[PDB]
Design a protein around this ligand. Structure first.
Ligand SMILES: CCCSc1c(F)c(F)c(S(N)(=O)=O)c(F)c1F
Ligand SMILES: CCCSc1c(F)c(F)c(S(N)(=O)=O)c(F)c1F
Ligand SMILES: [Zn+2]
Length: 257
């Protein structure tokens, strides 16, 4: 029964998930001036040409676009990673207002939303055993700013009225996540956690420097979704972000500058 409300939001999560106060929690503020350029970081390899989306689901916290992760189709590697990480799903976090919504911040700046492309390390054989490992996941985070529309996002936007409420799903095939990327793959990276319960400390975060633009209308449609189930009073799905957590002497490493 955790959520994003006054009574069950991020400041309460520690009572059911005590690692909320752990040593490598996410998100964090990215101090750009203190991030360390690491010339030995490799370019990120995003190989999404064979991706197979399957379904979109309103899970009552966000919506997930799900992929077939039963073979190496869409994979992430390179960058700071060892080995190969398979795309399982993506989702977003967003605000009630354009001035908020992202989980990570950049010099305390908040973006209107943040996209998370979640990948699990193939050496652990599937997702549920990967989340138990300290290098189990790689999450590619991409900031969203409001401006010109992102035409690769519109297929997601348009399906949302079919998954308005918690537990609804819809077929969602042939969606190409390459259309959600910015032009540059420059990034920051650090070791962290899931940003939702169970808050497990299993994630290598890779946060792109370059945001994508989405239109006002696109993010407005995200804000029409509901946290509640059908036949319950409406609770708009907004402000589904965890605030920045203590860095606790982790170093954020930059691939650029
Ligand atoms: C007004 C009803 C809230 S009951 C409750 C809660 F308060 C929590 F903090 C959580 S938590 N710690 O998971 O956020 C929880 F699961 C709950 F069920
Ligand atoms: C095991 C928890 C449910 S799946 C999941 C996840 F894998 C994430 F990486 C994230 S995130 N936000 O850390 O990318 C997330 F929110 C999730 F819900
Ligand atoms: Zn997320």
């Amino acid at each position: 029964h955790w959520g994003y409300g006054k009574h069950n939001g991020p400041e309460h999560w520690h009572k059911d998930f005590p690692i909320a106060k752990g040593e490598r929690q996410s998100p964090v503020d990215i101090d750009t001036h203190t991030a360390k350029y690491d010339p030995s970081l490799k370019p990120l390899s995003v190989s999404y040409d064979q991706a197979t989306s399957l379904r979109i689901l309103n899970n009552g916290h966000a919506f997930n676009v799900e992929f077939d992760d039963s073979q190496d189709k869409a994979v992430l590697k390179g960058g700071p990673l060892d080995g190969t990480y398979r795309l399982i799903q993506f989702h977003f976090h967003w605000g009630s207002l354009d001035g908020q919504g992202s989980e990570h911040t950049v010099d305390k700046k908040k973006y209107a939303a943040e996209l998370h492309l979640v990948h699990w390390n193939t050496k652990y054989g599937d997702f549920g055993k990967a989340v138990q490992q300290p290098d189990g996941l790689a999450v590619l985070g991409i900031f969203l700013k409001v401006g010109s529309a992102k035409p690769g996002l519109q297929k997601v936007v348009d399906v949302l009225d079919s998954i308005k409420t918690k537990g609804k799903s819809a077929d969602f095939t042939n969606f190409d996540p390459r259309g959600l990327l910015p032009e540059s793959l420059d990034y920051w990276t650090y070791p962290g956690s899931l940003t939702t319960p169970p808050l497990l400390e299993c994630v290598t975060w890779i946060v792109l420097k370059e945001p994508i633009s989405v239109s006002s209308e696109q993010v407005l449609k995200f804000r029409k979704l509901n946290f509640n189930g059908e036949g319950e009073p409406e609770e708009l799905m907004v402000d589904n972000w965890r605030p920045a957590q203590p860095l606790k002497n982790r170093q954020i490493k930059a691939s650029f500058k």
